[PDB]
Amino acid sequence: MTWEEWDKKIEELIKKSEELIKKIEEQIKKQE
Amino acid sequence: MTWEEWDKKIEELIKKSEELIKKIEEQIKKQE
Amino acid sequence: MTWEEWDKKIEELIKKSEELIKKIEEQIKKQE
Amino acid sequence: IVQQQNNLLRAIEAQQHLLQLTVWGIKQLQARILAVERYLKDQ
Amino acid sequence: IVQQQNNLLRAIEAQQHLLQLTVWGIKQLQARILAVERYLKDQ
Amino acid sequence: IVQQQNNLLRAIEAQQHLLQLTVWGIKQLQARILAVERYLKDQ
């Protein structure tokens, strides 16, 4: 594995993780 | 960013994470 | 702490984390 | 129990910030070892 | 609310892959600093 | 479904320990590269 491949996989997983946190945080506000 | 700033942010986030785990673990015992 | 001890603790925690993800993912499929 | 999920989320948000900080450190160390490896090679 | 847990799980799965990638990097850096430390010693 | 949250929590607790171990390693590597950087400078 190459460090630039590492940089690519890290960035994608972080973005995905952030979008999932937004999803959850909104489905709570739809109730609470 | 400075490595001592890094040490400070890491330690605060770990403590906060630990206190949140205690919170959750108790709200389960109040039922189960 | 020794780096080989580090390798041992990391691997155990990853395996445990993976088995817990499988547990949760199945208890959802039992419903949804 | 919706109170629970709001707390499960808060723990995940805290670990999300811890991960970004570890990634920062790994990138810094990788650049520093590379500069050392290149130095020894140039000598 | 079962929709919620399926999303709480998806965030945990994403962080599980991030952790494995950080572990990979730490192992790589540890091997590279060790090779440098040994080089300076052999000289 | 409370059984679910107890399992969601157990996964988070496991990842909390993984993070503390990665932080340990990053601190070790940072100290080792610093000692090397200082060595090359003193020479």
Numbering used by the authors:
A (entry chain B), B (entry chain B), C (entry chain B): 41 to 72
D (entry chain A), E (entry chain A), F (entry chain A): 3 to 45
The authors write:
After the binding of the gp120 to the cellular receptors, gp41 undergoes conformation changes after fusion peptide (FP) inserts into the target cell membrane, exposing N-terminal heptad repeat (NHR) trimer, and forming the six-helix bundle (6-HB) structure. Peptides derived from the HIV-1 gp41 CHR are potent HIV fusion inhibitors, which specifically interact with the viral gp41 NHR to form heterogeneous 6-HB to prevent fusogenic gp41 core formation. Our previous studies have shown that AP1 and AP2, artificial peptides with non-native protein sequences, could form coiled-coil structure to interact with gp41 NHR and inhibit HIV-1 Env-mediated cell-cell fusion. To elucidate the molecular determinants of these artificial peptides, we successfully solved all three complex structures of AP1/AP2/AP3 peptides binding with gp41 NHR.
Here we designed a new artificial peptide, AP3, by adding Met and Thr to the N-terminus of AP2. However, a similar strategy failed on the crystallization of AP3; therefore, we decided to cocrystallize the synthetic peptide N45 and AP3 peptide, and eventually the complex crystals were obtained. Interestingly, the crystals of three different inhibitors belong to three distinctive space groups: P21 for N36-L6-AP1, R32 for N36-L6-AP2, and P63 for N45/AP3. As expected, the N-terminal Met and Thr of AP3 forms a hook-like structure. The hydrophobic methionine side chain of M41 accommodates the groove between AP3 and NHR helices, capping the hydrophobic pocket. This interaction leads to a series of conformational changes. The main chain of AP3 at W43 moves 1.91 Å closer to NHR compared to AP2. The side chain of W43 in AP3 flips around 90 degrees and is buried deeper than that of AP2. The side chain of E44 turns back to interact to D47, but the E45 side chain turns back from K48 and interacts with T42. Therefore, this M-T hook structure could further stabilize the binding between AP3 and NHR target.
